[PDB]
Structure 1
Amino acid sequence: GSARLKGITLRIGVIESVPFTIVANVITTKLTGYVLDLIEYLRDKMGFVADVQLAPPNTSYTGLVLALANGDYDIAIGDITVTSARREIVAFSNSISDNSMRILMRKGTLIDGMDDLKNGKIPYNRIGIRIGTAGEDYYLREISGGSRNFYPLKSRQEMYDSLLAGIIDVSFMDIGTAEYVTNNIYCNLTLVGEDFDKSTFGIVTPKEWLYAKDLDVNILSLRETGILDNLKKKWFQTKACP
C-alpha cells in the first residue's frame, strides 16, 4: 500500500558536503545548505516532522546507505549517487540532480586527463580515492581492473590535505561540489579533463517504502516548478577565487 507523510516523524540522515550540507560550530552545531533548504520545502509541503541527523565524521556514502538499510535512518538526503550496488539494498527517489565526476589535482601537476591515469602515467598508489564512494566504483571498473591499489581516503578533508601536501597526485570528485570547492575554497586546486561517470543523485529510502509515491510526486513537482534549479543557483553560483 501507500500513504502520506503528513504528521510522520522522519529521521533524515545527512552527510557533510559543502554547499549541500554545511556544518558550523557555534557556542552546538548549525546545519545549512541546499539539503537543509530542500528539507524545508518538503516539510512545508508534506507535513512530516523533520528529525535531521548528521552522519558521524568520516562516514562514507556507502556507509550512510548501509546505516539506513540497517534501520538507523528513515531517509537520507544528500549528494548521494544512485548506484546498482546501492539499489540492491535501498530504494531511491526520483533524481534530485544530474551528476558527473571530474579529475581533481593541485595546480602545476602534469596531468592532461583520464588517459594519463589509464595509461599508467601516475603510480596507482598516488591516485587518492575516497572509499565508499561512486568514484571508487569507477576506479575499480575503469582504471585498475578491479584491484584496490589506490591511496585510500577517509574524507574530502583528507583528499584536499593529501593533494596539497603532495602525498597523492590526483583524485576524483562530483562536478557540482568540485566546481564549488576549487572556485571558492582551494584556489590552488583545479579540475582537468572531460567529465565522466554521468549519473544522478537521489534520496535514499527503504525498499518497498510506504511513502514512495508521496515523496516522488513532491520531488518531481519541485523539479517542474523550478525550485530545485533555484536552490542550485542559490548555493552553487558563487566564485571567490581570483
Structure 2
Amino acid sequence: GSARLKGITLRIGVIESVPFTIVANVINTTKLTGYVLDLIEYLRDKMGFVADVQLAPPNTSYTGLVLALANGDYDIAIGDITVTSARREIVAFSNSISDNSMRILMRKGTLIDGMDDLKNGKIPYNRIGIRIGTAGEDYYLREISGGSRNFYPLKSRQEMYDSLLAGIIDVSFMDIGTAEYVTNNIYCNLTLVGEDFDKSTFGIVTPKEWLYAKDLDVNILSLRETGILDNLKKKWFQTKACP
C-alpha cells in the first residue's frame, strides 16, 4: 500500500559536500546549511514530516551512506547521490532531483587535454586519484582500468584536493555541479579539463518498496515543475569568487 508522511519522523541521512550540505562549527555545536537543507525544509513544509537530519560520519563514502540506509540506519538519504544499477539492487530512489555528469579535475598547468590522456596511459594509474565508494570509482573500473583497482585511493574530497595540491596525484573526477563550485570559489589553482562524461542523475535514497514512495515522488516532481529546484540551484551554485 501507500501512505502520507504527515506526522512521521524521518531520519534523514546527509553527507558533507559544499554547497549541497555545508557543516559549520559554531560555539560548541554544528550547524548545517545548503541546497540539501533548504530542500528538506520545502519538503517538510509541504509534507509535514518531522525532519531528524543526521550527518554521516567523517570519511563515509557515498556507497557507505547507501549501505547504512539499507541496513536501517536512516529512513531516507538526501544529497548529491548518484543513481546507479548496483545501488538500485539494494535501495530505491526517488524521481531525479538533478541531472548530473562528471568532469576531470587537475592542477592548473598540468599537461592533460582530457579523458583520452587517462585512457591512453599518459598518466601513471597510481597518480589518478579516485574516491572509493563513489560513482567515479565505478566509471574508472568500467572504462579506464578494466576492473583493476590501480588508482590512488582517496577517502574524501578533502584528501582529493590536498593530494592534487601536494602533487601526489595528477587528476581526479568530480560531479559537474560541485566541480564548478569548488574550482570557481575555493581552489583557484585547480581547474576542469575535457568534455563532461557519465551523464547521470541524483535521487533521494529510500528503502525498497517504501510505503511513502508516491508521496515523496509527487512532491519532488511538483518542486521541479514550479521552479523551486531551479531556484535552489541558482541560490547555492551561481556564485564565483575566484578571479
TM-score, structure 2 normalization: 1.00
Deviation at 1:62, TM superposition (A): 0.2
CA displacement 1:56-94 (0-9 Å, x = unmatched): 000000000000000000000000000000000000000
Provide the rounded CA distance (Å) in 2 between the counterparts of 1:186 and 1:99. 21
Provide the rounded CA distance (Å) in 1 between the counterparts of 2:85 and 2:143. 16
Task: Find the residue that maps to 1:146 and give its secondary structure.
Answer: coil
Deviation at 1:121, TM superposition (A): 0.2
Provide the rounded CA distance (Å) in 2 between the counterparts of 1:111 and 1:56. 34
CA displacement 1:25-67 (0-9 Å, x = unmatched): 0000000000000000000000000000000000000000000
Provide the rounded CA distance (Å) in 2 between the counterparts of 1:193 and 1:146. 23
Provide the rounded CA distance (Å) in 1 between the counterparts of 2:153 and 2:110. 20
Deviation at 1:97, TM superposition (A): 0.1
Provide the rounded CA distance (Å) in 2 between the counterparts of 1:148 and 1:77. 28
User: How many positions carry a matched residue from both structures?
Assistant: 242
Provide the rounded CA distance (Å) in 1 between the counterparts of 2:121 and 2:21. 36
Gaps of 5+ in 1: none
Provide the rounded CA distance (Å) in 2 between the counterparts of 1:222 and 1:26. 31
Identity, % of aligned positions: 100
Provide the rounded CA distance (Å) in 2 between the counterparts of 1:190 and 1:159. 13
Deviation at 1:2, TM superposition (A): 0.1
Deviation at 1:4, TM superposition (A): 0.1
Provide the rounded CA distance (Å) in 2 between the counterparts of 1:145 and 1:11. 38
Paired position in structure 2 for 1:134: 135
Task: Find the residue that maps to 1:99 and give its secondary structure.
Answer: strand
Deviation at 1:109, TM superposition (A): 0.3
CA displacement 1:90-120 (0-9 Å, x = unmatched): 0000000000000000001000000000000
CA displacement 1:110-154 (0-9 Å, x = unmatched): 000000000000000000000000000000000001100000000
TM-score, structure 1 normalization: 1.00
Deviation at 1:19, TM superposition (A): 0.1
CA RMSD of aligned residues (A): 0.2
Provide the rounded CA distance (Å) in 2 between the counterparts of 1:110 and 1:137. 25
Deviation at 1:220, TM superposition (A): 0.1
Task: Find the residue that maps to 1:103 and give its secondary structure.
Answer: strand
Provide the rounded CA distance (Å) in 2 between the counterparts of 1:224 and 1:134. 28
Task: Find the residue that maps to 2:79 and give its secondary structure.
Answer: coil
Task: Find the residue that maps to 1:140 and give its secondary structure.
Answer: helix
Gaps of 5+ in 2: none
